[PDB]
Design a protein around this motif. Structure first.
Motif, PDB file in Angstrom:
ATOM      1  N   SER A 200       0.831  -1.209   0.000  1.00 30.37           N
ATOM      2  CA  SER A 200       0.000   0.000   0.000  1.00 30.37           C
ATOM      3  C   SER A 200       0.865   1.259   0.000  1.00 30.37           C
ATOM      4  N   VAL A 201       1.968   1.232   0.754  1.00 33.06           N
ATOM      5  CA  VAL A 201       2.932   2.336   0.744  1.00 33.06           C
ATOM      6  C   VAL A 201       3.514   2.575  -0.669  1.00 33.06           C
ATOM      7  N   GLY A 202       3.896   1.506  -1.359  1.00 34.94           N
ATOM      8  CA  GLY A 202       4.353   1.614  -2.752  1.00 34.94           C
ATOM      9  C   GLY A 202       3.325   2.318  -3.642  1.00 34.94           C
ATOM     10  N   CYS A 203       2.061   1.926  -3.510  1.00 38.38           N
ATOM     11  CA  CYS A 203       0.961   2.521  -4.291  1.00 38.38           C
ATOM     12  C   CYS A 203       0.830   4.021  -3.994  1.00 38.38           C
ATOM     13  N   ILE A 204       1.033   4.375  -2.739  1.00 36.63           N
ATOM     14  CA  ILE A 204       0.781   5.741  -2.288  1.00 36.63           C
ATOM     15  C   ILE A 204       1.982   6.553  -2.727  1.00 36.63           C
ATOM     16  N   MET A 205       3.173   5.981  -2.576  1.00 43.10           N
ATOM     17  CA  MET A 205       4.387   6.653  -3.024  1.00 43.10           C
ATOM     18  C   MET A 205       4.376   6.912  -4.543  1.00 43.10           C
ATOM     19  N   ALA A 206       3.978   5.923  -5.322  1.00 43.57           N
ATOM     20  CA  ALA A 206       3.878   6.140  -6.770  1.00 43.57           C
ATOM     21  C   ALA A 206       2.920   7.293  -7.065  1.00 43.57           C
ATOM     22  N   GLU A 207       1.758   7.286  -6.421  1.00 40.97           N
ATOM     23  CA  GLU A 207       0.778   8.364  -6.597  1.00 40.97           C
ATOM     24  C   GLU A 207       1.289   9.748  -6.191  1.00 40.97           C
ATOM     25  N   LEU A 208       2.073   9.844  -5.111  1.00 41.45           N
ATOM     26  CA  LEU A 208       2.712  11.119  -4.727  1.00 41.45           C
ATOM     27  C   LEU A 208       3.665  11.620  -5.818  1.00 41.45           C
ATOM     28  N   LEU A 209       4.478  10.711  -6.359  1.00 40.55           N
ATOM     29  CA  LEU A 209       5.401  11.052  -7.434  1.00 40.55           C
ATOM     30  C   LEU A 209       4.782  11.469  -8.773  1.00 40.55           C
ATOM     31  N   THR A 210       3.642  10.862  -9.147  1.00 41.96           N
ATOM     32  CA  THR A 210       3.057  11.027 -10.486  1.00 41.96           C
ATOM     33  C   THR A 210       1.797  11.840 -10.494  1.00 41.96           C
ATOM     34  N   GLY A 211       1.189  11.992  -9.316  1.00 38.01           N
ATOM     35  CA  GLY A 211      -0.102  12.654  -9.199  1.00 38.01           C
ATOM     36  C   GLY A 211      -1.323  11.804  -9.588  1.00 38.01           C
ATOM     37  N   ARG A 212      -1.117  10.498  -9.837  1.00 29.52           N
ATOM     38  CA  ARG A 212      -2.122   9.605 -10.419  1.00 29.52           C
ATOM     39  C   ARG A 212      -2.169   8.277  -9.681  1.00 29.52           C
ATOM     40  N   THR A 213      -3.378   7.723  -9.545  1.00 31.79           N
ATOM     41  CA  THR A 213      -3.507   6.367  -8.987  1.00 31.79           C
ATOM     42  C   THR A 213      -2.647   5.388  -9.743  1.00 31.79           C
ATOM     43  N   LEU A 214      -1.873   4.600  -9.012  1.00 30.27           N
ATOM     44  CA  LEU A 214      -1.061   3.595  -9.662  1.00 30.27           C
ATOM     45  C   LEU A 214      -1.883   2.451 -10.285  1.00 30.27           C
ATOM     46  N   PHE A 215      -2.806   1.872  -9.528  1.00 32.93           N
ATOM     47  CA  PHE A 215      -3.612   0.737 -10.027  1.00 32.93           C
ATOM     48  C   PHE A 215      -5.119   1.062  -9.929  1.00 32.93           C
ATOM     49  N   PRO A 216      -5.605   2.015 -10.722  1.00 30.41           N
ATOM     50  CA  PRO A 216      -7.036   2.396 -10.638  1.00 30.41           C
ATOM     51  C   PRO A 216      -7.961   1.383 -11.341  1.00 30.41           C
ATOM     52  N   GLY A 217      -8.063   0.166 -10.794  1.00 29.20           N
ATOM     53  CA  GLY A 217      -8.845  -0.902 -11.388  1.00 29.20           C
ATOM     54  C   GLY A 217     -10.343  -0.616 -11.341  1.00 29.20           C
ATOM     55  N   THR A 218     -11.066  -1.040 -12.377  1.00 27.15           N
ATOM     56  CA  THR A 218     -12.538  -0.804 -12.444  1.00 27.15           C
ATOM     57  C   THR A 218     -13.281  -1.869 -11.656  1.00 27.15           C
ATOM     58  N   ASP A 219     -12.518  -2.877 -11.209  1.00 29.00           N
ATOM     59  CA  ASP A 219     -13.004  -4.012 -10.433  1.00 29.00           C
ATOM     60  C   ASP A 219     -11.790  -4.877 -10.031  1.00 29.00           C
ATOM     61  N   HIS A 220     -12.014  -5.878  -9.182  1.00 29.54           N
ATOM     62  CA  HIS A 220     -10.911  -6.752  -8.723  1.00 29.54           C
ATOM     63  C   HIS A 220     -10.032  -7.297  -9.855  1.00 29.54           C
ATOM     64  N   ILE A 221     -10.667  -7.763 -10.934  1.00 29.46           N
ATOM     65  CA  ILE A 221      -9.950  -8.464 -12.014  1.00 29.46           C
ATOM     66  C   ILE A 221      -9.165  -7.484 -12.883  1.00 29.46           C
ATOM     67  N   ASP A 222      -9.816  -6.377 -13.225  1.00 32.06           N
ATOM     68  CA  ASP A 222      -9.162  -5.312 -13.964  1.00 32.06           C
ATOM     69  C   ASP A 222      -7.967  -4.782 -13.171  1.00 32.06           C
ATOM     70  N   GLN A 223      -8.132  -4.633 -11.859  1.00 32.64           N
ATOM     71  CA  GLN A 223      -7.022  -4.197 -11.012  1.00 32.64           C
ATOM     72  C   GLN A 223      -5.837  -5.184 -11.019  1.00 32.64           C
ATOM     73  N   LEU A 224      -6.115  -6.484 -10.864  1.00 33.96           N
ATOM     74  CA  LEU A 224      -5.063  -7.486 -10.933  1.00 33.96           C
ATOM     75  C   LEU A 224      -4.318  -7.397 -12.286  1.00 33.96           C
ATOM     76  N   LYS A 225      -5.048  -7.214 -13.397  1.00 33.34           N
ATOM     77  CA  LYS A 225      -4.391  -7.092 -14.712  1.00 33.34           C
ATOM     78  C   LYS A 225      -3.447  -5.907 -14.746  1.00 33.34           C
ATOM     79  N   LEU A 226      -3.876  -4.788 -14.160  1.00 35.75           N
ATOM     80  CA  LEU A 226      -3.002  -3.610 -14.038  1.00 35.75           C
ATOM     81  C   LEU A 226      -1.772  -3.883 -13.181  1.00 35.75           C
TER      82      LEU A 226
END
Ligand SMILES: On1c(-c2ccncc2)c(-c2ccc(F)cc2)c2ncccc21
Length: 344
Positions: A200-226
């Motif tokens: 979760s820290v990795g996800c939040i850190m990526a988002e701080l750096l880029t300004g964008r959700t790292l894995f903005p999945g539309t559902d569980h499966i779409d998120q896993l693909k991302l």
């Protein structure tokens, strides 16, 4: 015992000690409700929470106990502190209401998403608080920008402990409630370790750096693909560790993909940030960097002080595997209210 006064607020009668003044509603929900107040005894802006239905069922009574135990234990700069807990009851027999008090938080990490040195300082503080909570075998499980409180000076606290588990409906679809979750817990692959929080820290850190959700999945499966597009499909080694035949079998249905080059994803980013991200965002949780190891990572050289990164006192959670009756959990909660001693 202090004197309490009564006041009608977000549809219930609030009964609080006189020290707490100017109550104003700030939040509401199935958990109960929260008022801002000024604590004349300390000079602090506080959040006062009145629990709703604290002892309605076994699961509710145990959850109330769990939240109080957790909040009472936390004694760290980067973690929510319990300022006060009280009840207007004078005995266990008349005990019904629980109010919890902490520092009033304003901005969260959302109302902030930055320069690289800002990112350093913020992630440093999360990991600092994580080292502390993990040293007591406490796993957050739900870290996201919305429970990371930040002040004007960029000082950070991790909030949300022992709160009611999210529902299936709340985790469904295009929702930030799931975007920061490690895949093993999102898809229930296996018993999960402390490093679910590092993912979760990795996800939040990526988002701080880029300004964008790292894995903005539309559902569980779409998120896993991302996720698998970034970090690669699992090898045989991690596949064996997914204890669900169903999950493992589904994962195997997917076309194999190699781990991407992180410098080509996080363009322009400090190479030390990139290296840290690659070490946090590892699919196999046994191989993820821990909070303590990450604090020693060169990315944080400007903030790292091994003598100012404390661990926690032992936290006895044997109660978690205990079965008790409503009235028993409630009595244990009472004892915990009564034994509370305020911080300096
Ligand atoms: O926003 N918010 C808060 C909250 C905290 C700080 N500032 C504003 C709201 C709390 C909270 C309040 C007092 C406590 F002792 C513990 C948790 C809370 N609990 C459940 C759900 C939402 C909550």
């Amino acid at each position: 015992r202090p004197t309490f006064y009564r006041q009608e607020l977000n549809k219930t009668i609030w009964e609080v000690p006189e020290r707490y003044q100017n109550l104003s509603p700030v939040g509401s929900g199935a958990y109960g409700s929260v008022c801002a107040a000024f604590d004349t005894k300390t000079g602090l802006r506080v959040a006062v929470k009145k629990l709703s239905r604290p002892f309605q069922s076994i699961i509710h009574a145990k959850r109330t106990y769990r939240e109080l135990r957790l909040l009472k234990h936390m004694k760290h700069e980067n973690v929510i502190g319990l300022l006060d807990v009280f009840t207007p009851a004078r005995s266990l027999e008349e005990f019904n209401d629980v109010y919890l008090v902490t520092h009033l938080m304003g901005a969260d990490l959302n109302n902030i998403v930055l320069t690289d040195d800002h990112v350093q300082f913020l992630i440093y503080q999360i990991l600092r608080g994580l080292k502390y909570i993990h040293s007591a075998d406490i796993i957050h499980r739900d870290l996201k920008p919305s429970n990371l409180a930040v002040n004007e000076d960029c000082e950070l606290k991790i909030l949300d402990f022992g709160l009611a588990r999210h529902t299936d409906d709340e985790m469904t679809g295009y929702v930030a409630t799931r975007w920061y979750r490690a895949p093993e817990i999102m898809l229930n692959w296996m018993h999960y370790n402390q490093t679910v929080d590092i993912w979760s820290v990795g996800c939040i850190m990526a988002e701080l750096l880029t300004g964008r959700t790292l894995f903005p999945g539309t559902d569980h499966i779409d998120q896993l693909k991302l996720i698998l597009r970034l970090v690669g499909t699992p090898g045989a080694e991690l596949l064996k560790k997914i204890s669900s035949e169903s999950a493992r079998n589904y994962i195997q249905s997917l076309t194999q993909m190699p781990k991407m080059n992180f410098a080509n994803v996080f363009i322009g980013a400090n190479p030390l940030a990139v290296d840290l991200l690659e070490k946090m965002l590892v699919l196999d949780s046994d191989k993820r960097i821990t909070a303590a190891q990450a604090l020693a990572h060169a990315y944080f050289a400007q903030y790292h002080d091994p003598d100012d990164e404390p661990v926690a006192d032992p936290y006895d959670q044997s109660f978690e595997s205990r079965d008790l009756l409503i009235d028993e959990w409630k009595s244990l909660t009472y004892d915990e209210v009564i034994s509370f001693v305020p911080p300096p």
